[PDB]
């Protein structure tokens, strides 16, 4: 994360969760890197427990997340001279969206009594709508690049850790240690316990 703090001009921890300055000594497990672009002030909608438009039918966050989001502004790469209508978002749905999953389905949503055979008729509309992005637009219409990082902790061994590998094991000394991110203090002796490989 040290190089990533200066690779991009992103917002410096406008979120609640893991300690920002201590992120070197975090051996997290099973991240899910999701990248998408939004419009205007929809960054505040991506919050744990927040109720809105994107947070209700597009991407919902649970009460416990053990993480936060990373966002930055990009009005050049996501905007062209002509109309840039390459992004679509769903606002119509039959019911609520369960978190931690995506339900992609291009289906006709009905509002009246009569149904429709996949035809946008009188009371039948479509959930997907485009994003209006232009370089001359204001702050409330600029395309914002938002990526979410989840840092849940599991009992499985951590495949990622900070570069803090040094020193050596010391035996029969009541010394402090931070093995696998767990702080403790005690002697380091041997025993007759038989340990399975897993």
């Amino acid at each position, epitope marked *: 994360y040290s190089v990533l703090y200066n690779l991009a001009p992103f917002f410096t921890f406008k979120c609640y969760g893991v300690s920002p300055t201590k992120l070197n000594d975090l051996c997290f497990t099973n991240v899910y890197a999701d990248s998408f672009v939004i419009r205007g002030d929809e960054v505040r909608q991506i919050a744990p427990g927040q109720t809105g438009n994107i947070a209700d039918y597009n991407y919902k966050l649970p009460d416990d997340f053990t993480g936060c989001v990373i966002a930055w502004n990009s009005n050049k790469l996501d905007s062209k001279v002509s109309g*840039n*209508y390459n992004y679509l978002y769903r606002l119509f749905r039959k019911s609520n969206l369960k978190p931690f999953e995506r339900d992609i389905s*291009t289906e*006709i949503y009905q509002a009246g009594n009569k149904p429709c*055979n996949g*035809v*946008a008729g009188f009371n039948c509309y479509f959930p*997907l709508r*485009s994003y209006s992005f232009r370089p001359t637009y204001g702050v409330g219409h600029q395309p914002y690049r938002v990526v979410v990082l989840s840092f849940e902790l599991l009992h499985a061994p951590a495949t990622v850790c900070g570069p803090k590998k040094s020193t050596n094991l010391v035996k029969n000394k009541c010394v402090n240690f931070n093995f696998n991110g767990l702080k403790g203090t005690g002697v380091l002796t041997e025993s007759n316990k038989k340990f399975l490989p897993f």
Partner: antibody
Amino acid sequence: QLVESGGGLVKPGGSLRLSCAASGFSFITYNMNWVRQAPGKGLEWVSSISSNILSSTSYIYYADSVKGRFTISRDDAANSLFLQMNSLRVEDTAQYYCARTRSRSVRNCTSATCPVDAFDLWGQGTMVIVSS
Amino acid sequence: DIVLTQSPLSLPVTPGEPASISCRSSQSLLRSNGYNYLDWYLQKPGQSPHLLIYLGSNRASGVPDRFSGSGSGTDFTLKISRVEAEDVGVYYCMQALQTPYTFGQGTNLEIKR
């Protein structure tokens, strides 16, 4: 559709490339079809292609002539569509309209038949001649 | 395929009186859940064709209310309240099946001024 590219004095033994140039418009998530006109009274549908967003397969719907000597290829990156002809047996005059299919959903459509609602975005600017 | 016959293809029409145009489909189109699989197309000569009525007996694409189409079974027609100088353009008929689509024969629409 605001402007179209292609159309010129091309021999029947050559290759024909036709395309539509677009602007800010829901082009990526819409099915695309081609319509050409005869100098006499009457038209005929020539080609159509679906989108990759709604389904993985392209939903190829062709008549006999366009299986004979036509092909299509999308891009899924910009607002354009490329139409390529490997051979030209008999094609004297054509307008090659760029009409839009008024259907955002697909249902009960197999590889044989699929309903179409209407068209409202016909485009002019492609004129092909083989008079040499 | 499907053949389309336009019986009133050549007729002089005067402003102020309704005009009717009919098309016939070879195959039956009764397989419908309340949505008639037929629509009409208007081709303005010179710039671009336009859409008047889409699938079903409804209105879309900003069509004026003077255009009205209806039909159920072996009967199809289009009703106009009054033709004007902006109504110059040939008409076509279409059904929403038989993916090798074929247009009908073109009209002329010579308004009798």
